[PDB]
Amino acid sequence: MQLTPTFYDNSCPNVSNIVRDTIVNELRSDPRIAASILRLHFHDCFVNGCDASILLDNTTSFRTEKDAFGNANSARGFPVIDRMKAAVESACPRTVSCADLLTIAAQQSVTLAGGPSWRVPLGRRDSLQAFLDLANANLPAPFFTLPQLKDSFRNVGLNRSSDLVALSGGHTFGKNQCRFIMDRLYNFSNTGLPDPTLNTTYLQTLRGLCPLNGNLSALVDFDLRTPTIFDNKYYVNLEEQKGLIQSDQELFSSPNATDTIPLVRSFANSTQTFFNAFVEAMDRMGNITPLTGTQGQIRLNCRVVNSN
Ligand code: HEM
Ligand SMILES: O=C(NO)c1ccccc1
Ligand SMILES: [Ca+2]
Ligand SMILES: [Ca+2]
């Protein structure tokens, strides 16, 4: 069946508010949680669809996706998702799937951070297993070239250039570890020189935050203009060659960016245009091979498959 935003309007009408309240409370002690949650949803959807497979803990039958390159010592916010699920289960027992919960949490996170507000289609169910090997092959890496980023998205059904450019806008907030930009800073492409597409003045600031022999786990803001606000500033940075990671700047500086540049220019000069495109791309991503109707289950605890 098709996903619909009205799925819980009768069975659990306040699920949206329960999710929002949880994030609002968490934001007070962790201003980064909204960014972390949106990212969890993205990593869920790109591996076998938005089926909450990423939330499963390791078992003797399958390995957790939390160990995947890109998730290990990177993804976070799991206990917050647990709190959300516990609250929803008390109000609406065995009604809301973890897959749908993570979807609503991602939308609310964007809205709470100043982004657009919309009702996400719902009705997804939870997977019976995790897919580590698939996660290690499906998640795009920061060193991918533009054509490789395009292939990665097309691989899961997001075959429009707007999907890539709009969803990349999720880097309008959140943090990135020094380790993922060390090459751009000191030795790009085995050349011994920094990435020529990185603004030289910005390069100095970044080198100060990520010293050659420093802490590779140190965090840097993805968006130097409004680090915690969900807006179109991410695109303005690209125009000034101030995109933080390689995959960011390529949207504007790659020799294959013929079709992405116009979107970047458009999004950088119109919040409304970017927000509309982001909502459309988000709903498309949220529709990647979902389990519906009778497939999968409604997990009682997002970390484990139901017993019986
Ligand atoms: C186009 C390919 C993409 C690549 C190569 C990529 C790469 C990365 C990397 C390297 C990090 C830093 C991880 C760390 O330092 O631990 C990150 C964080 C993040 N990404 Fe992406 N990303 C991509 C797409 C997306 C998309 C589509 C979204 C969501 C719509 C997204 C949302 C985020 C957020 C919000 C964070 C920060 C999370 C936090 O602060 O906890 N990313 N991404
Ligand atoms: O966030 C990622 N992919 O979306 C990612 C992060 C680091 C290494 C590999 C991939
Ligand atoms: Ca998944
Ligand atoms: Ca921002």
Max Cα-Cα span within the chain: 61
User: Which of these, 93, 129, 157, 138, lies nearest to 286 by C-alpha position?
Assistant: 157
Let me know: does 236 contact 268? Beta carbons within 8 Å: yes
Please report which helix (H) or strand (E) contains residue 177, including its range.
Answer: strand 175-177
**Residue 30 structure tokens:** 């962790």
**Residue 196 structure tokens:** 């020529």
CA of 235 to the centre of ligand 4 (A): 9
Cα separation, 147 vs 238, in Å, equals: 18
Ligand 1, atom 41, lies closest to the CA of 36
Give domain limits for the chain: 3-139+286-306, 140-285
User: Which of these, 64, 13, 99, lies nearest to 289 by C-alpha position?
Assistant: 99
Let me know: does 169 contact 274? Beta carbons within 8 Å: yes
CA of 170 to the centre of ligand 4 (A): 9
CA of 91 to the centre of ligand 2 (A): 35
Q: How many CB atoms lie within 10 A of CB 8?
A: 20
Let me know: does 19 contact 84? Beta carbons within 8 Å: yes
The residues pairing with 122 across neighbouring beta strands, listed in sequence order, are: 4
Q: Does the active-site annotation cover 43? A: yes
36 within ligand 1 shell (Cβ under 6 A): yes
Pairing of strands 175-177, 219-221: antiparallel
**Residue 123 structure tokens:** 């009705």
Let me know: does 302 contact 55? Beta carbons within 8 Å: yes
Resolution for this model in angstroms, one decimal place?
2.0
227 within ligand 2 shell (Cβ under 6 A): no
CATH for the 140-285 domain, from 2.40.50.100, 3.40.50.460, 3.40.50.150, 1.10.420.10: 1.10.420.10
Cα separation, 49 vs 3, in Å, equals: 13
User: Which of these, 246, 14, 69, lies nearest to 144 by C-alpha position?
Assistant: 246
**Length of the chain as a residue count:** 308
Cα separation, 87 vs 228, in Å, equals: 26
CATH number of 3-139+286-306: 1.10.520.10
Q: How many CB atoms lie within 10 A of CB 298?
A: 16
* Residue of 32, 42, 46, 250 to test ligand 1 pocket, by largest number of atoms within 8 Å of CB: 42
Cα separation, 177 vs 234, in Å, equals: 17
Helix residue spans in the chain (DSSP H): 15-29, 33-45, 78-91, 98-112, 132-138, 146-154, 161-167, 182-186, 200-209, 233-239, 246-253, 261-268, 271-285
**Residue 263 structure tokens:** 């979107």
* Residue of 66, 108, 136, 168 to test ligand 1 pocket, by largest number of atoms within 8 Å of CB: 168
